[PDB]
Write a protein that binds this ligand. Structure first.
Ligand SMILES: OC[C@H]1O[C@H](O[C@H]2[C@H](O)[C@@H](O)[C@H](OCCCCCCC3CCCCC3)O[C@@H]2CO)[C@H](O)[C@@H](O)[C@@H]1O
Length: 265
């Protein structure tokens, strides 16, 4: 593989789309690689990590409990509810809802949790309160995945998302237990985590949340590193490509390959 920046450029040429990426040390925030890091990209399901950070902040303040059971109705469900459609009789706890949102990308779980933090506007306010002045959530699932060209709704930048993830995971804004919970939910991703491990060399840590839109977008927020350590945050977003989902996936994987082969920068 080529050097990471060279591979990112090649991916734009092959996809005819825009790529945005940051690679950052998790412990310190050192930025190693920036490419279109201040340009906007749709978050898609990657927003669910920030959502559950806001839920955990409420738990830490005594305004929520991960144990609290939410009884919801079938009319509350939106498209793609693999976990939440199974619990119309018995409900789900707040913590189960976050696990479903992050680890299964369950959309109805995410909307139930979004309500608890004051909707898109409440989540955006939380972001402002932790010093992210760029990321914005405007819509609910599934409309937030529309990814219309030129639309600023439901977007982040690679730089803002990486900094926000680092804040949630490490800055002691969340309690120790809450930081550990957020990390574990990402470690437990079932959508892409197992597939990524099956193509990662031995020794590499992964934790992640992915997102997708049928209108030529794709993204991942990840923790990655050798020696089984979550050394770096890697954020990659794609937009405005006509390419197949498979080719979007392959190009993101190719950027990862370039990082792995050229890690010590
Ligand atoms: O010399 C480095 C390594 O080179 C290859 O590893 C390949 C691997 O066989 C392939 O499957 C992967 O694809 C990359 C898969 C990307 C995984 C995650 C991508 C995401 C998630 C994390 C952030 C970035 C994007 O590339 C590496 C590096 O070439 C060898 O197989 C391996 O023995 C060797 O240790």
């Amino acid at each position: 593989s080529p050097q990471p920046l060279e591979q990112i450029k090649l991916s734009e040429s092959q996809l005819s789309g825009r790529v945005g990426m940051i690679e950052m040390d998790l412990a310190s925030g050192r930025t190693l690689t920036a490419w279109r890091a201040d340009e906007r990209f749709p978050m898609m399901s990657t927003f669910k990590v920030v959502l559950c950070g806001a839920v955990l902040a409420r738990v830490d303040a005594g305004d929520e409990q991960l144990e609290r059971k939410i009884h919801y109705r079938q009319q509350d469900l939106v498209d793609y509810s693999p976990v939440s459609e199974k619990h119309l009789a018995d409900g789900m706890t707040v913590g189960e809802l976050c696990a479903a949102a992050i680890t299964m990308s369950d959309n109805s779980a995410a909307n139930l949790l979004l309500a608890t933090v004051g909707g898109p506007a409440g989540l955006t306010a939380f972001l402002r309160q932790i010093g992210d002045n760029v990321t914005r959530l405007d819509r609910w699932e599934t409309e937030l995945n529309e990814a219309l060209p030129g639309d600023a709704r439901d977007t982040t930048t690679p730089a803002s998302m990486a900094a926000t993830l680092r804040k949630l995971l490490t800055s002691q804004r969340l309690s120790a237990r809450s930081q550990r919970q957020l990390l574990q939910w990402m470690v437990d991703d079932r959508v892409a985590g197992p597939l990524i491990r099956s193509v990662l060399p031995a020794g590499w840590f992964i934790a992640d949340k992915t997102g997708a839109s049928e209108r030529g977008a794709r993204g991942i927020v990840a923790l990655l590193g050798p020696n089984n350590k979550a050394e770096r945050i890697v954020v990659i977003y794609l937009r405005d490509t006509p390419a197949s989902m498979a080719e979007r996936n392959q190009q993101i994987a190719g950027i990862g390959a370039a990082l792995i082969e050229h890690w010590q920068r």
